[PDB]
Structure 1
Amino acid sequence: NLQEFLGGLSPGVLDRLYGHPATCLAVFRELPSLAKNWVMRMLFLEQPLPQAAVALWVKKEFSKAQEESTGLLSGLRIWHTQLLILNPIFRQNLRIALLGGVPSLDKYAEERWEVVLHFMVGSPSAAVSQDLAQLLSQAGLMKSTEPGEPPCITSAGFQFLLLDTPAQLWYFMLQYLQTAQSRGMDLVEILSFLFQLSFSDSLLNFLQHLREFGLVFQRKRKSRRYYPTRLAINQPGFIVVETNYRLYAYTESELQIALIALFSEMLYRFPNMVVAQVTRESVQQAIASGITAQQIIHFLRTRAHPVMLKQTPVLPPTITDQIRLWELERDRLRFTEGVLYNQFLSQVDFELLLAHARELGVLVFENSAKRLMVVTPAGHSDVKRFWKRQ
């Protein structure tokens, strides 16, 4: 989440990131419940106040909210104890932020994201962009290993594909920022633009990438002014599930049919409908590719036709249980690398080694009755060194 992203930052980058135009407001909106009130209170104070007052300024009931808010805002470093006055820079910027100082766009964003997903999947016809391809490859969801041949899809790719559009896009942009730092693009400058959206060379390249993703569209031959789409700021279902593992999806866009075929066997394709079967072969194929039953169940639930919404639960228990059992059977045999021991002359030495392995985290499994244990190869060197030291 954005809270995680901002928490994972240093004070030096934080205060700089607290730009005047928007950041002080975007980070404010993050404040879940109460920290908003305290920020407004001590927005006008130039004198720090004791911590005991803040501690006692919440009733005995619901105090956990007080501690969690205080910890979150301490991590954000909005104030300093100075002994709890807010940062002067943040105070000034917030005062300046508080009385101081479309139908075609959404369709465009939808179409651009749909073609991006088409390229992500093995679609013969898709938009071509070397920068987009390499960005997705280095995002960790795609690996090529051969420039001549089109890149394939890794295990994480299918999991990313089956996610809902909001979380999918949010994770994609998170990876975009993480790779932006690696490629050398300044993180603060690009990050501030995202906050400003909800209200230089690097800026131009970043805006080009955002337009390729479909969040923005200049509409004027790449002019300075931009009109963000709905997705920039941050629908009814169509699948009907039977009790015989049969899916009838009212899908016209090839993306939905491809997503369903990823874990189901297609039987018929009507102009406004498609029939597929959820069989062991397809489900285990998806599981081997990397998906887990949770993603499939969530995908079918979110793309649930209104007809089956009346019944509770929406997805039939038999279908859900069958999918879960199919995924479990694959991982019945759990493989874990390790090193076995044999010929323990005395149990005292074995117990001491067990205690050492428990302390170091090396141990994976132990058997006192048989006087043996298993250690991962990483801890094999440590235990071997201990044995040599005697």
Structure 2
Amino acid sequence: NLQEFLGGLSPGVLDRLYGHPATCLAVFRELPSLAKNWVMRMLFLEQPLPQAAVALWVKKEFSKAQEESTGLLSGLRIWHTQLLILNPIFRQNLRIALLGGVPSLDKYAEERWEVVLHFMVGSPSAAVSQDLAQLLSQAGLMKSTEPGEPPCITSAGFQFLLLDTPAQLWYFMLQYLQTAQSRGMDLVEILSFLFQLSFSDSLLNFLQHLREFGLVFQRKRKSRRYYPTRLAINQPGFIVVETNYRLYAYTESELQIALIALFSEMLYRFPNMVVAQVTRESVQQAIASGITAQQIIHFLRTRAHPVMLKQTPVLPPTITDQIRLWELERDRLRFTEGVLYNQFLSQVDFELLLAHARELGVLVFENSAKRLMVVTPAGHSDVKRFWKRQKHSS
């Protein structure tokens, strides 16, 4: 979430990111319930106040809200104890932010995201863009390994595909920012634009990428002015599920049919409907590709036709249980690197060695009944030395 993204930041980047135009307001809206009230209170105070007052300024009931809000805003570093006055820069910017100093667009965003997903899946016809392809490849959801051949889809790719559009886009933009820092694009400048949307060379490239994603559209041969789409700020279902593992989806866009075929066997395709079967073969194929039953169940539930909404639960218990059992049927091997010792002599002496590999992060599996500790070869030169020291101590 955006709260996680902002919490994972340093004070030096935080105060700079608190730009005058929008950031002080976008981060304010994040404040879930009560911290808004305290920010408004001590927006006009130039004198810090004791912490005991803030502690006792919430009744005994519902105090956990007080502690959680205080911790969240301490992490955000909106104020400092100074002994709880707010940061002067944030106070000034917030005062400046508080009395101081379309139908075609949504369709465009939908179509652009749909073609992006078409390219993501193995669609022969899709929009071509080398920058988009390499960005998706380095986002961790795609791997090519051969420039001549079109890139394939990794295991995480299917999971990302089956996610809903809001979370899908949000995670995609999170990965975009994380890779922006890697490629060298300043994070603060690009981040501030997202906040400003909900109200330079790097800016132009970032806006080009956003337009490729379909969140914005200049509409004037790439002019300075832009008109953000609905997705920039941040529908009825069509699938009918039977009790015999049969799906009737009122789908005209090929994207939905492809998504359903990812985990179902298609039987018929009518102009305004398509018939598929959820069989062991298709479900286990999806599970092997990497999906888990939770994504499939959530996808079918969110794309649930209004006819089946009346029944509770919306998705039949037999279908849900069958999908879950099919996914459980498979349990899979793992991969790690390690080295094992033996002849550990005294018992109380083996317990002290277990804490050496656990603190360094090179321990995989321990055994106090046989004395059997696995150590990765990456930290083999540090565990052996410790063992030698212990032997010397005797």
SS in 1 for 2:366: strand
Query: Residue by residue, what CA displacement relative to the aligned partner does 1:298-322 show, whole Å, maximum 9, x if unpaired?
Result: 1111111112212222122222222
- 5 Å-filtered alignment, 1:64-83, equals 64-83=64-83
Q: Measured at CA, do residues 264 and 373 of structure 1 come closer, stay the same or move farther in structure 2, by a change above 3 Å? A: same
Comparing 83-92 with 228-237, greater Cα deviation is found at: 83-92
Unaligned runs of 5+ in 2: none
Comparing 165-174 with 95-104, greater Cα deviation is found at: 95-104
Comparing 29-38 with 274-283, greater Cα deviation is found at: 274-283
Separation of aligned partners in 1, 2:88 and 2:344: 66
Comparing 229-238 with 219-228, greater Cα deviation is found at: 219-228
Separation of aligned partners in 1, 2:56 and 2:76: 22
Query: Residue by residue, what CA displacement relative to the aligned partner does 1:185-207 show, whole Å, maximum 9, x if unpaired?
Result: 22111111111111122211111
Q: Measured at CA, do residues 328 and 385 of structure 1 come closer, stay the same or move farther in structure 2, by a change above 3 Å? A: farther
Comparing 222-231 with 240-249, greater Cα deviation is found at: 240-249
1:252 to partner: Cα distance: 0.7
Comparing 168-177 with 369-378, greater Cα deviation is found at: 369-378
1:169 to partner: Cα distance: 0.4
Separation of aligned partners in 2, 1:264 and 1:381: 51
Instruction: Tell me the number of residue pairs that the alignment of Structure 1 and Structure 2 aligns.
Output: 390
1:364 to partner: Cα distance: 4.2
Q: Measured at CA, do residues 264 and 346 of structure 1 come closer, stay the same or move farther in structure 2, by a change above 3 Å? A: same
Q: Measured at CA, do residues 84 and 242 of structure 1 come closer, stay the same or move farther in structure 2, by a change above 3 Å? A: same
Q: Measured at CA, do residues 359 and 46 of structure 1 come closer, stay the same or move farther in structure 2, by a change above 3 Å? A: closer
Separation of aligned partners in 2, 1:369 and 1:184: 51
Comparing 121-130 with 340-349, greater Cα deviation is found at: 340-349
Comparing 152-161 with 363-372, greater Cα deviation is found at: 363-372
Comparing 332-341 with 70-79, greater Cα deviation is found at: 332-341
Q: Measured at CA, do residues 339 and 317 of structure 1 come closer, stay the same or move farther in structure 2, by a change above 3 Å? A: farther
Unaligned runs of 5+ in 1: none
Q: Measured at CA, do residues 362 and 176 of structure 1 come closer, stay the same or move farther in structure 2, by a change above 3 Å? A: closer
Q: Measured at CA, do residues 340 and 33 of structure 1 come closer, stay the same or move farther in structure 2, by a change above 3 Å? A: same
Q: Measured at CA, do residues 258 and 389 of structure 1 come closer, stay the same or move farther in structure 2, by a change above 3 Å? A: same
Query: Residue by residue, what CA displacement relative to the aligned partner does 1:314-367 show, whole Å, maximum 9, x if unpaired?
Result: 122222222222222221666666555556666565555456556666554455
Separation of aligned partners in 1, 2:277 and 2:11: 54
Q: Measured at CA, do residues 251 and 369 of structure 1 come closer, stay the same or move farther in structure 2, by a change above 3 Å? A: same
Separation of aligned partners in 2, 1:281 and 1:364: 35
Q: Measured at CA, do residues 191 and 353 of structure 1 come closer, stay the same or move farther in structure 2, by a change above 3 Å? A: closer
Q: Measured at CA, do residues 18 and 382 of structure 1 come closer, stay the same or move farther in structure 2, by a change above 3 Å? A: same
Query: Residue by residue, what CA displacement relative to the aligned partner does 1:201-236 show, whole Å, maximum 9, x if unpaired?
Result: 221111111111111111111111111110000011
SS in 2 for 1:285: helix
1:97 to partner: Cα distance: 1.1
Separation of aligned partners in 2, 1:371 and 1:201: 60
Q: Measured at CA, do residues 344 and 94 of structure 1 come closer, stay the same or move farther in structure 2, by a change above 3 Å? A: closer
Q: Measured at CA, do residues 70 and 156 of structure 1 come closer, stay the same or move farther in structure 2, by a change above 3 Å? A: same
Separation of aligned partners in 2, 1:258 and 1:20: 45
Q: Measured at CA, do residues 370 and 111 of structure 1 come closer, stay the same or move farther in structure 2, by a change above 3 Å? A: same
Q: Measured at CA, do residues 355 and 271 of structure 1 come closer, stay the same or move farther in structure 2, by a change above 3 Å? A: same
Q: Measured at CA, do residues 378 and 305 of structure 1 come closer, stay the same or move farther in structure 2, by a change above 3 Å? A: farther
- Residue 229 of structure 2 aligns with which residue? 229
Q: Measured at CA, do residues 269 and 310 of structure 1 come closer, stay the same or move farther in structure 2, by a change above 3 Å? A: same
Separation of aligned partners in 2, 1:56 and 1:22: 32
Separation of aligned partners in 1, 2:346 and 2:90: 66
SS in 1 for 2:274: strand
Separation of aligned partners in 2, 1:11 and 1:133: 34
Query: Residue by residue, what CA displacement relative to the aligned partner does 1:46-88 show, whole Å, maximum 9, x if unpaired?
Result: 1111111111111111111111111111111111222211112
Percent sequence identity is 100
SS in 2 for 1:115: helix
SS in 2 for 1:80: coil
Q: Measured at CA, do residues 359 and 182 of structure 1 come closer, stay the same or move farther in structure 2, by a change above 3 Å? A: closer
Separation of aligned partners in 1, 2:303 and 2:21: 39
Query: Residue by residue, what CA displacement relative to the aligned partner does 1:129-187 show, whole Å, maximum 9, x if unpaired?
Result: 11111111111111112111111111111111111100110111111111112222221
SS in 1 for 2:232: helix
Q: Measured at CA, do residues 42 and 344 of structure 1 come closer, stay the same or move farther in structure 2, by a change above 3 Å? A: closer
Separation of aligned partners in 1, 2:326 and 2:354: 37
- Residue 306 of structure 1 aligns with which residue? 306
SS in 2 for 1:276: strand
Separation of aligned partners in 1, 2:319 and 2:299: 13
Q: Measured at CA, do residues 299 and 378 of structure 1 come closer, stay the same or move farther in structure 2, by a change above 3 Å? A: farther
Q: Measured at CA, do residues 380 and 308 of structure 1 come closer, stay the same or move farther in structure 2, by a change above 3 Å? A: farther
SS in 1 for 2:157: helix
Comparing 72-81 with 162-171, greater Cα deviation is found at: 72-81
- Residue 343 of structure 1 aligns with which residue? 343
- Residue 317 of structure 1 aligns with which residue? 317
- Residue 374 of structure 2 aligns with which residue? 374
Q: RMSD in angstroms over aligned alpha carbons? A: 2.3
1:386 to partner: Cα distance: 4.5
Separation of aligned partners in 1, 2:245 and 2:290: 21
Separation of aligned partners in 1, 2:367 and 2:81: 52
Separation of aligned partners in 1, 2:247 and 2:103: 31
Q: Measured at CA, do residues 317 and 341 of structure 1 come closer, stay the same or move farther in structure 2, by a change above 3 Å? A: farther
